[PDB]
Design a protein around this ligand. Sequence first.
Ligand SMILES: CCCC1=Nc2nc(NCc3ccc(Cl)cc3)nn2C(=O)C1
Length: 305
Amino acid sequence: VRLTPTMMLYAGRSQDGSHLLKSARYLQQELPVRIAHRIKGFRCLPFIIGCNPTILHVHELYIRAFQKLTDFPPIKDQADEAQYCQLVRQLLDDHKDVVTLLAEGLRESRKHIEDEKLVRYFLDKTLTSRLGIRMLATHHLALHEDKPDFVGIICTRLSPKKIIEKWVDFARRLCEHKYGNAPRVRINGHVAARFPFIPMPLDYILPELLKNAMRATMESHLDTPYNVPDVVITIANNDVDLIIRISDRGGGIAHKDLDRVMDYHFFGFGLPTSRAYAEYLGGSLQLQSLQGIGTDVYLRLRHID
Ligand SMILES: CCCC1=Nc2nc(NCc3ccc(Cl)cc3)nn2C(=O)C1
């Protein structure tokens, strides 16, 4: 069994599938507790915010999810567990545009936001809660799968070089469509590291950070779009954490914008959600700006037990 903040992803196996029931019964009682905490966060929002028709709609979705989940009887066998997976899959679908509806509701409410820390902490708690819930749910759904090098959602031999390469090719495509070119990426450091890790957090953070590094490079080289400097990624693997540094030669975040980059913009969500995700899983996301030259972004993530 693996662990992250206060959650457990069961790594045990059984011939008779009894491991699926131990995991499903844990999931069955954890999800309503996690969803009730989000309802409490919605009830504690300032009145003027919480009664915004869009924010109110998202609040209602959370009440419907807790209702559908608590109205599901306790899981007695494989047949019960199978139907519980259908409910979980329906909730993941009904809450797909929750972040889109949140930023859209909070944008209208911007005329009443005297303190930006309120919106940051509400979005940090809401976005990390869905990460924890999606990880918990998709791990269980993946315990039925017979994937190679995966115990549920935990990759038994994850290669940080390989996962970075997958998202570099993705970001270079978006970059190439927008600007006609994309900076090449050079990966150095512990390029041969292989270890147990959950890819899902990296699968959100990496494409966002890579998009930012490539956008910055392109925006600071309008003169020569066909010839832009490389983005350098350095991998540092050790017993405590995995460090992935992303360096760009994109001019750097200006002194007057240094605070604004880590806040939610109404959408500029990549950097603040990535930092919330990193902190939620025991890590960090730090920025080092060399104004006039570029930015160095340090992503640290704690290893699995
Ligand atoms: C297949 C998933 C569809 C997706 N389409 C997307 N379009 C963008 N445009 C923002 C952007 C483009 C280029 C640079 Cl350089 C920076 C930012 N992002 N994006 C996704 O993340 C996923």
